């Protein structure tokens, strides 16, 4: 689908916050999500997945208050809790506006694409990151995309970050193709 179609899809699943926030930056986050293949976005929409953009801390939302003080998986030793984490992906998606870029409380290439990749993995693709096919790819290429002690340890995180590289822009797409050829082909074939 075109960018126009994907933004149309995203206008039906993206939820904007009540309080004040940077409207232009929220729009920029939507624009980057619009690079995701429309097949995935419409599957998320069919499953009533909402992409919640947040004006404050994740745990300030009523539905995430249960995570206050909880140490996220893989963040052991960081001294941080979910209160300080700018994004969440999986059965739901919640993203703090303004924290997209690497270094804004995270080291993902892009916050919203990484988090939405987790939701696509889990909701649309039946946890494909844990499939035998992807485990063999992850075993070979899981350390070729940096942050090897994190991406190289958790297949779901390698899937999510590889997904983000594939769709952020053409430079990251090409960088993935050179560093992780089997992962690139896997994602290319997955999208038809």
């Amino acid at each position: 689908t075109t960018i126009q179609q994907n933004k149309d899809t995203l206008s039906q699943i993206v939820v904007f916050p009540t309080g004040n926030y940077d409207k232009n930056e929220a729009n920029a986050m939507v624009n980057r999500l619009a690079n995701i293949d429309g097949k995935y976005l419409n599957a998320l929409k069919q499953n009533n997945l909402k992409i919640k953009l947040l004006s404050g801390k994740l745990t300030d939302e009523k539905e995430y208050a249960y995570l206050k003080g909880v140490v996220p998986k893989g963040w052991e030793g960081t001294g941080k809790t979910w209160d300080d984490v700018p994004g969440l992906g999986g059965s739901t998606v919640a993203l703090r506006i303004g924290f997209s870029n690497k270094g804004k409380g995270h080291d993902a290439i892009n916050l919203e694409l990484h988090a939405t990749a987790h939701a696509i993995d889990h909701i649309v693709l039946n946890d494909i990151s844990k499939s035998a096919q992807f485990k063999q790819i992850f075993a070979k290429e899981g350390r070729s995309l940096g942050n090897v002690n994190f991406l190289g340890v958790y297949p779901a995180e390698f899937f999510a970050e590889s997904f983000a590289y594939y769709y952020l822009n053409q430079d990251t797409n090409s960088k993935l193709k050179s560093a992780c050829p089997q992962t690139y082909s896997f994602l290319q074939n997955l999208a038809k």
Binding site: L67, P72, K73, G74, W75, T78, K80, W82, V85, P86, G87, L88, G89, G90, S91, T92, G105, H106, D107, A108, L111, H114, A115, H118, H122, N147, F150, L151, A156, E157, A160, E161
Partner: peptide, 7 residues
């Protein structure tokens, strides 16, 4: 299921 971003 919840997953945090890369630290």
């Amino acid at each position: 299921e919840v997953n945090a971003p890369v630290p």
